[PDB]
Design a protein around this ligand. Structure first.
Ligand SMILES: [Sm+3]
Ligand SMILES: [Sm+3]
Length: 689
């Protein structure tokens, strides 16, 4: 029954004392217990926990990142919350404080003495040095960045700096013999405050800090008018306009632990009660977010409202978020590397057959596109979220989540629709596709009204054509959320494998991977679903009219198909009517949005431009399609895009997810969520807040 005490990793004599007072205040409270291990730095604290020598340490963004790097695998368990001047947050602005009349503009920093909180943290280093990178003249990765900055500022006070090799980086540090440049509250200038003083005492001319710092020691407006903000555009404004003025915005500091056996469950209890037993003015016997006049920021960041518990799928990268990981990694990749990465495009494949495919496209384009894959649509969405990946094709069903995660649909898949297949596609308004209800005419007693407890084949859950529309419908008639209970059994990969919904699925040829949601599941997607009913594994196939068409009457030359015939298939129609496969126009459940590639709005454009190129060299009329590669072709296997894709088009202004899918569906979908919820939709829920 008992569960251990949280080992908290301190960093200087200061921290312990504080940690101390906490542990005891804690027990005096009859709350989960604590303890303090003792090392010398945040970087150290990391390793310690790594080797289960301890369990937690509140970390800076910059440090979180390192903490997540391979060997250690640390996770932002909890997040602090601060000022904002109004509505509380987990994001903070990174600035530059200089004394009125110092003159120099941010682009002029060469020659100035500068202050820094410590090595590698956001506000003081990560953000700043990257900004000024364009004036460093530093070979890149091969040549130590320390020497750069070293030689960029006349001298300075860099905590954790390797002042032996680059003494200039700790010159300014006012610290005793070895306390000098120490990487803890033993160095007076270490930390936000730290830096501010380093500027206040005239040591430096520019401090890189937290947006609240200044107000965090200048209680009197007057004093506050003595200083300013170096805005990235080259002007200077007042300390309280960080809002416009700032080098960057960066995510909150966080309580980190182990990828595995972190004891998350003990940590969060500790902090939760802590907010509650000694946070914002609750008692007077102790104060979490209160530190000595000697040193600030002990254990947590001073005057932090409190914490928020991060959801678990969140692993650092993500926590950070794109914008930050790129630049952070940017300070350790060559310019070349850099510009390289900016000009290309990494596509995110789901499943092997696809990666293969992405591999082709790669070699065919001469690397203008490269590849990033994984086992689940979710998965490739995250990757874009993290920045290992730029983009991929989504179906409206994933559009919705992607959109929830802040991504935007760039180009649309436009079928060789029918009117006039001239370069109309490009401008042609995406006209949609019909999700139909399919079964064996053979089996006619059957209707839409009959599907209670029968066999169903779904292309994928969380997808439109199949899942979304029908279940949504069924949701409208059953008044109940037990999706697995409706059809006797089912085939719908990405469902819980030990459920009926993944009952009728066949895993790859060697029957492995039952229910995964990708092409190995021979019953996955459009085709796979049509066959699941074809091989009669089930009775009702939720798919697109077109679907049937593509594999019957000798279309797909695959055995299971081969002798399939249009006439053999009937459409269930919303009024109990059944029709042949052609009357779809009047025999469908509804109209689905065409699929849509997507990425971070950021690259929105460049994404568009090279794909447009790629599509002029390899899609519908690809001068080289039947020749050395066809982007839009994949052996009735739908690799990357639908096999009938004429091309990809302009969204006719639909630029926000809602716009593209439209209110209704969107609403249709948000209704279902009342039934269920996914991991990533949740994740984002907290990140985008
Ligand atoms: Sm910081
Ligand atoms: Sm689809």
């Amino acid at each position: 029954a008992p569960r251990k005490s949280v080992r908290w990793c301190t960093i200087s004599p200061a921290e312990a004392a504080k940690c101390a007072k906490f542990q005891r205040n804690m027990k005096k409270v009859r709350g989960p217990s604590v303890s303090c291990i003792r090392k010398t730095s945040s970087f150290e604290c990391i390793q310690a926990i790594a080797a289960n020598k301890a369990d937690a340490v509140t970390l800076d963004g910059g440090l979180v990142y390192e903490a997540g790097l391979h060997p250690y695998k640390l996770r932002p368990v909890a997040a602090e919350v601060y000022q904002t001047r109004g509505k509380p947050q987990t994001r903070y602005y990174a600035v530059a404080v200089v004394k009125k009349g110092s003159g120099f503009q941010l682009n002029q920093l060469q020659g100035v003495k500068s202050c820094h909180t410590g090595l590698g943290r956001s506000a003081g280093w990560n953000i700043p040095i990257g900004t000024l990178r364009p004036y460093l003249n530093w070979t890149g990765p091969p040549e130590p960045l320390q020497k750069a900055v070293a030689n960029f500022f006349s001298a300075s006070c860099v905590p954790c700096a390797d002042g032996k090799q680059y003494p200039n980086l700790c010159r300014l540090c006012a610290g005793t013999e070895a306390d000098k440049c120490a990487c803890s509250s033993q160095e007076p200038y270490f930390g936000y405050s730290g830096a501010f003083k380093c500027l206040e005492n005239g040591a430096g001319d520019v401090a890189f800090v937290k947006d609240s710092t200044v107000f965090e020691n200048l209680p009197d407006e007057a004093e506050r008018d003595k200083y300013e903000l170096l805005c990235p555009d080259n002007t200077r404004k007042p300390v309280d306009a960080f809002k416009e003025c700032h080098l960057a915005r960066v995510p909150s500091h966080a309580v980190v632990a182990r990828s595995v056996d972190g004891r998350e469950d003990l940590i969060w209890k500790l902090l939760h009660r802590a907010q509650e037993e000694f946070g914002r003015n609750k008692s007077s016997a102790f104060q979490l977010f209160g530190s000595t006049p000697g040193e600030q920021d002990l254990l947590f960041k001073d005057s932090a409202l409190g914490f928020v518990r991060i959801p678990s799928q969140i692993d650092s990268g993500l926590y950070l978020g794109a914008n930050y990981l790129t630049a952070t990694q940017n300070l350790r990749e060559t310019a070349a590397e850099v510009a390289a990465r900016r000009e290309r495009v990494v596509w995110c494949a789901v499943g092997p057959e696809e990666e293969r495919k992405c591999k082709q496209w790669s070699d065919v384009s001469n690397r203008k596109v490269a590849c990033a894959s994984a086992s689940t649509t979710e998965e490739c969405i995250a990757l874009v979220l993290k920045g290992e990946a730029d983009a991929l094709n989504l179906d409206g069903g994933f559009i919705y989540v992607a959109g929830k995660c802040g991504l935007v649909p760039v180009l649309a898949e436009n079928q060789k629709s029918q009117n006039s297949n001239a370069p109309d596609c490009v401008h042609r308004p995406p006209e949609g596709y019909l999700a139909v209800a399919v079964v064996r005419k053979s089996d006619a007693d059957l209707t839409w009204n009959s599907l209670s407890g029968k066999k169903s084949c779904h292309t994928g859950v969380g997808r439109t054509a199949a899942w979304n529309i029908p279940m949504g419908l069924l949701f409208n008639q059953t008044g109940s959320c037990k999706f697995d209970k409706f059809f006797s059994q089912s085939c719908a990969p990405g469902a819980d494998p030990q459920s009926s919904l993944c009952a009728l699925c066949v895993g790859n040829n060697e029957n492995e991977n039952k229910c995964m949601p990708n092409s190995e599941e021979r019953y996955y997607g459009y085709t796979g679903a049509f066959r699941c009913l074809a091989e009669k594994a089930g009775d009702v196939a939720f798919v697109k009219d077109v679907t049937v068409l593509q594999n019957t009457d000798g279309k797909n030359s695959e055995p299971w198909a081969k002798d399939l015939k249009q006439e053999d298939f009937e459409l269930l129609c919303l009024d109990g009517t059944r029709k042949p496969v052609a009357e779809a126009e009047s025999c469908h459940l509804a109209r689905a949005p065409n699929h849509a590639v997507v990425s971070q709005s950021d690259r929105a454009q460049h994404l568009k431009k090279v794909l447009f190129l790629q599509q002029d060299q390899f899609g519908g009329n690809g001068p080289d399609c039947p020749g050395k590669f066809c982007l839009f072709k994949s052996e009735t296997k739908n690799l990357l895009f639908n096999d009938n894709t004429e091309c990809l088009a302009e969204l006719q202004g639909k630029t926000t997810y809602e716009q593209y899918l439209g209110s209704e569906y969107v609403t249709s979908i948000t209704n279902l969520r009342r039934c269920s919820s996914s991991p990533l939709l949740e994740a984002c829920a907290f990140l985008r807040a």
